[PDB]
Design a protein around this nucleic acid. Structure first.
Lengths: 120, 178, 70, 58, 166, 128, 58
RNA sequence: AGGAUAAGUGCAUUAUGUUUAUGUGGUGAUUUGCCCUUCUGUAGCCA
RNA sequence: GGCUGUCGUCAGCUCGUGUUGUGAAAUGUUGGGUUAAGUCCCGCAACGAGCGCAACCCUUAUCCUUUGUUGCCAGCGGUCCGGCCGGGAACUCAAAGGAGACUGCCAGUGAUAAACUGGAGGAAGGUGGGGAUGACGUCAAGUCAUCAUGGCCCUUACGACCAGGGCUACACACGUGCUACAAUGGCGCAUACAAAGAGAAGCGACCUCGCGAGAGCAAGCGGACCUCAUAAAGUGCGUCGUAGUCCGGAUUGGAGUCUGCAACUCGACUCCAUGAAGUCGGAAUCGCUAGUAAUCGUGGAUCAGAAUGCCACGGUGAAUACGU
RNA sequence: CUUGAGUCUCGUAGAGGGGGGUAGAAUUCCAGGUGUAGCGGUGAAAUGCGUAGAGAUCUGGAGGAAUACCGGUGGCGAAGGCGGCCCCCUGGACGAAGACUGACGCUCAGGUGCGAAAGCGUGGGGAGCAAACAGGAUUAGAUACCCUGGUAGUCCACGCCGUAAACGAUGUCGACUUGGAGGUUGUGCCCUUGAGGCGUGGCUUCCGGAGCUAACGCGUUAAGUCGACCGCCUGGGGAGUACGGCCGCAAGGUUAAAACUCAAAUGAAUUGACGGGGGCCCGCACAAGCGGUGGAGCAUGUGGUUUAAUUCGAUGCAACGCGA
């Protein structure tokens, strides 16, 4: 991004850049974050089999949104719903709800004293 | 095979000409690698046509190079069932080069006293639709115009295509489904 | 099979590739089959079997969009 | 087990060698046999310690 | 990159070794496959099949896989409190209660698998497939049919298991 | 496999119109022109210049058969045409196009393809 | 397929009681580290206190 | 005049996708098959 | 043991490790689209990294750039008008820093997309032209005969000094390549321009001898200085008609030469007279994308003596690449 | 008693059984009319049929198997078994309300009864196809492969011992265990809104959970959880034969074994290779061409063949202008 990636064959550099961008876009989750997450948020089941597959292998509790082509068994917490769009994926998992917002008022006496701003 | 389409290259001009139809005529007239003789073989031929008629030097040349010249070619394909053919339309560049090649093979065995007389007489002879490659142009185009009624392994291809999205008609194909 | 009536967007040749479905549908659609009274249920009559491949072909159209190959 | 020619066909084209000397003409043969001999006999004399590369130069 | 379970004691039970072939497609490479068992002294479900270029790198791979996706499990005294017949995938093995006065009685690599499992005094006959790769499931399936002691009276014995969650 | 094109040579009818009967199979075509009173003014077939194998039933041997028979019925002084079709066999379309290109009308392309009830046993001496 | 920087190679040959053993040891230090580098000038302008012999300019 | 659902313009070889001769038996890659843990223990085998 | 050929530039293979199955083992390392490419868009248990490939690399192409001889010459002198030399630096020119060109742009194509093709200025556009350049590895593949080497044999020999004979015979078949069968060529006469390199027991101007090749002597040389060298085909004009000719010139008689006492079979080159096979060759069958292919000469490696080859160079220099 | 089962009327689905009735059209034939040379067969092919007039076509008669498409993963029968459509005689199943009986139940050694098909006695019948038998095609042949004529046979009915892949592949029958949906059907409800949904049963099939398998696979019709009661197995080959009892005109059928041989035989699945099953891809490997070896002669290597010996190494691609 500074421009410091130049080579006398521009093709070898711009082609590494396109593929670097795909890494940035794919990894952007764990990229800026301090280590393995304390929950794993799987929105889809239908094609993203792997995200659930690895969560069971690391033992990390699962927070799941299941559709009518997926079972609610074998994951620890569910929203009954559908996998697409904003119909179940941030309609309870945002500031409009009260239940993702009363959990967070219980963080304010355990590891912090104030942290409620950060989160939706 | 082939990972990509690849076209023709640049061809350089010759020390006696700046016209292309002349430079491409000397080129496939080239044998032993030595064009610098073929320059003269083209210009000595063209003067003899020009004495036969003075309206042009090009009189017999331009229609011989149309008349002995094909338009279509037929390949033979079969991997099962029965024997079939697939006609293709080909490029002007190869239509022209079959025709010029056949003019220079036919004229060099024509056995007259100068290569200049031999070529002016063999273009004069094909110009009037009665030379030696009129037969070759007529047979080859007949076979490609005729085998348009066939396609590679037709009998299984007719069921195979409509199952995997395709047409219910009868069509030629490049070694695949129809 | 050419059919008496004409196809949609019509021309002066009648053809069966546009408005036939029941003609020679078991009369000559057969290959060397002999006189039988129960063998067709598993030899000949493969409608359950053949429906699956077609279903699979309709299934793959959704799934290419869903991976965003388009 | 094809064993591509692992270094010989790779030298002198910004890749140094274990000899650097100049000779030409017909005496190149008299200088190379002499260079083999000095390579063979000299490293045997300093064999008391282990040794990592050898370079002989004229 | 995973959590692992440990025992305060060493197990390096190598049970099998194999080689991978494709025979024309890149011909045949020198690679080996290996199966290695990691107990605890009282048992684990720890079984690991892994593969690499050479035998040492191969076993150490396989020893790693014997302690990830696996947990230890436990049984009091050198006997089992149930006469049950453990079956895993045609390799079927038997147990009946016994004394401490007998220890192991078994051969090959099986005497080494049973010692860490805690089911070596109760060791009764195996049947079906009893070649090395599957015979060794004693400490897996034979500890999933498990019984283990927790009562003070035999007539409180079924009552005591009910109140463990009620 | 062609009827007389030359005049006076055989009995003429000269009724301006006829019907053609096409028997289409995977091994041959028989194209036979008849009078509207029901009498043969000429025929041809697809082995009329020696097609054999698969090539004997294909659109191009079906076409030249239609072109041999259509020629002759101009000396029987016919000018208009009707067609009966019998089989889902190949060249069944190339044959229609050939009658109409021979300089006849082909407005009524009447399917009357017969139905066997499968009263016979077909030849088998094999696995299929 | 490397052809830039020296990289170190040895073929051992030796016998013991049962017959001959051998190791072919290729070791790779660097792809521009080690060896010579390509010279970065002509030798023609440099270190020349008098830019002529005559050249027609006197 | 019901051969008039006009093809429900839902349609595509329509349910065996087939056939023109064959050629012996075994054979490559190791003699430490060894480099993860206290106590309850392990690969020739040990804390 | 060392070493190397194959698949193939296949477009994939492997190293560490997780996972799914009881496992053998897969997965990745497989699909679609794209490529020299594990390159790049999409995407499933593959993640991280290396190999093949890309790169650094030497070379060319204009062009910038410096040296200015053993290189060059626009004007100028000696002058037969030759850089031989007084002299000059515009100039190629040699070897090297390199510049320029990146599939970067634009347009079409392509699933958005890598990238292919077209488009353009320019010396030059297809990852600029050329070359380097080829994975793990089965194949009991081939060398114990470069060389290494045990088990294991001779050591008056499975060692070693000396002469002569033979592979290269000739019956033919077979691999490869050479030059012809034509006239795009040969001939006659007249006429032209190279690049590169080899020469310290050597070659080598002049010399005298020689039909030519060469010979012995020798200034000289270190090869941009001197010599191989008249480079040939090609070019100019005229000529030739499928007739073995106006192509080809083998055999053979007979003379002259080289390294060496010693050229007969086994060696090589020059030259005089006559003169045959061969009309573009069947089954079979390969190489080639442009300095290539074709074709003509040249030098060199080798090298006691000598080339039709190979290896590299320069002359003259092509058709087309739809399609699998 | 009903919580098991049995039974009446009412309704409904279907090729169950036994016996009757009936139409159109391809192959095949005859006749007459019209009309001329191939027709047939197949991978491609020949044998075959045909000028004594074939093939095809109009009109009209002949004849027997056969009956599409609807027809489906449907449904029926005791399992195998049942297929044009309809009725008569009658079975067995599927639903619903009124009504009744009230363990009348479960399994089954022995047992009697009972056939897809051909085999097979007699009667009916024969258009096409066919073992055999001939002949073609294929090839080391050619009995397999493939075709053509051509007979018993096929085709009908009963009858004689009932053979088999004679099956919810899974004994019999029943109770219990998250469903959803397909095929198709009683019936309540719907815009009756398309083989649909919901309510409540039906056989019958896809899909997958608890549980099960070695794998495929099963999963409310189990291969789950089980129940009672009967059948059957103890490595393979040799053997579903021998041997014994029995039935059968008659070939046969039926349960079901060893010496001997032998370390296996056998269920499943991975990857390579491979399809001649389906489909995808690449190298100047072809093509698009051009030239070259193979033919001449020569150069040079190989073998053949030869002598005292004409030395080996190497044998398409991976030997032969290569070690050498």
């Amino acid at each position: 991004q500074d421009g410091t990636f130049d080579k006398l064959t521009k093709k070898e550099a711009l082609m590494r850049t396109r593929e670097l961008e795909k890494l940035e876009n794919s990894l952007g989750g764990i990229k800026d974050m301090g280590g393995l997450p304390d929950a794993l948020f799987v929105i889809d089941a239908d094609h993203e089999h792997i995200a659930i597959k690895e969560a069971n292998n690391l033992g990390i509790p699962v927070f799941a949104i299941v559709d009518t082509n997926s079972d609610p068994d074998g994951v620890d917490f569910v929203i009954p719903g559908n996998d697409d769009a904003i119909r179940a994926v941030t309609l309870y998992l945002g500031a409009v709800a009260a239940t993702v917002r009363e959990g967070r008022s219980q963080d304010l006496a355990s590891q912090a004293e104030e942290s409620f701003v950060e989160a939706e | 095979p082939r990972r990509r389409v690849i076209g023709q290259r640049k061809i350089l001009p010759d020390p006696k000409f700046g016209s292309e139809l002349l430079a491409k005529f000397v080129n496939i007239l080239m044998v032993d690698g030595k064009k610098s003789t073929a320059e003269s073989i083209v210009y000595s031929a063209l003067e003899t046509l020009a004495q036969r008629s003075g309206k042009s030097e090009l009189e017999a040349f331009e229609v011989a190079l149309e008349n002995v010249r094909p338009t279509v070619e037929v390949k033979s394909r079969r991997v099962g069932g029965s024997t079939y053919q697939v006609p293709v339309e080909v490029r002007p560049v190869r239509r022209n080069a079959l025709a010029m090649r056949w003019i220079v093979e036919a004229a060099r065995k024509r056995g007259d006293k100068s290569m200049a007389l031999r070529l002016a007489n063999e273009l004069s002879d094909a110009a009037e639709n009665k030379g030696t490659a009129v037969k070759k142009r007529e047979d080859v185009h007949r076979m490609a115009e005729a085998n348009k009624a066939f396609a590679h392994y037709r009998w299984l291809s007719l069921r195979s295509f409509s199952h995997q999205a395709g047409a219910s008609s009868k069509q030629p194909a490049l070694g695949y489904l129809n | 099979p050419v059919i008496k009536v004409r196809e949609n967007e019509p021309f002066d040749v009648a053809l069966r590739r546009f408005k036939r479905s029941c003609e020679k549908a078991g009369v000559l659609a057969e290959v060397r089959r002999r006189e039988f009274y129960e063998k067709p249920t598993t030899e000949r009559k493969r409608a359950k079997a053949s429906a699956v491949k077609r279903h699979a072909k309709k299934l793959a159209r959704e799934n290419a969009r869903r991976t965003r190959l388009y | 087990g094809q064993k591509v020619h692992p270094n010989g066909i790779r030298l002198g084209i910004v890749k140094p060698w274990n000899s650097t000397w100049f000779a030409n003409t017909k005496e190149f043969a008299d200088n190379l046999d002499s260079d083999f001999k000095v390579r063979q006999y000299l490293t045997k004399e300093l064999a008391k310690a282990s040794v990592s590369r050898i370079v002989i130069e004229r | 990159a995973h959590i692992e379970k440990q025992a305060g004691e060493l197990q390096e039970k190598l049970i099998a070794v194999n080689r991978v072939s494709k025979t024309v497609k890149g011909g045949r490479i020198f690679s080996f496959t290996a199966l290695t068992v990691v107990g605890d002294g009282n048992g684990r479900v720890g079984f690991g099949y892994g593969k690499a270029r050479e035998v040492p790198a191969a076993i150490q791979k396989a020893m790693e896989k014997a302690r990830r996706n696996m947990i230890n499990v436990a049984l009091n005294n050198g006997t089992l409190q149930h006469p049950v017949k453990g079956v895993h995938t045609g390799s079927r093995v038997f147990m009946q209660p016994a004394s401490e006065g007998t220890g192991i009685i078994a051969g090959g690599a099986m005497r080494a698998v049973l010692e860490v499992a805690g089911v070596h005094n109760v060791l009764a006959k195996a049947y079906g497939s009893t070649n090395p790769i599957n015979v060794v499931r004693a400490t897996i399936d034979g500890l999933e049919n498990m019984n283990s002691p927790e009562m003070v009276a035999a007539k409180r014995g079924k009552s005591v298991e009910e109140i463990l969650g009620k | 496999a062609k009827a007389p094109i030359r005049a006076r040579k055989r009995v003429r009818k000269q009724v301006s119109d006829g019907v053609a009967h096409i028997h289409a199979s995977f091994n041959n075509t028989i194209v036979t022109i008849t009078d509207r009173q029901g009498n043969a003014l000429g025929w041809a077939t697809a082995g009329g210049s020696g097609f054999r194998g698969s090539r004997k039933s294909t659109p191009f041997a079906a076409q030249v058969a239609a072109e041999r028979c259509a020629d002759a019925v101009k000396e029987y002084g016919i000018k208009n045409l009707e067609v009966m079709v019998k089989g889902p066999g190949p060249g069944r379309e190339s044959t229609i196009r050939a009658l109409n290109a021979a300089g006849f009308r082909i407005t009524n392309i009447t399917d009357v393809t017969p139905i066997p009830h499968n009263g016979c046993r077909p030849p088998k001496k094999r696995r299929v | 397929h490397t052809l830039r920087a020296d990289i170190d190679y040895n073929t051992s040959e030796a016998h013991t009681t049962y017959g001959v053993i051998g190791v072919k040891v290729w070791i790779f230090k660097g792809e521009i580290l080690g060896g010579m580098a390509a010279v970065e000038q002509p030798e023609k302008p440099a270190a020349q206190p008098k830019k002529q012999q005559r050249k027609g300019r006197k």
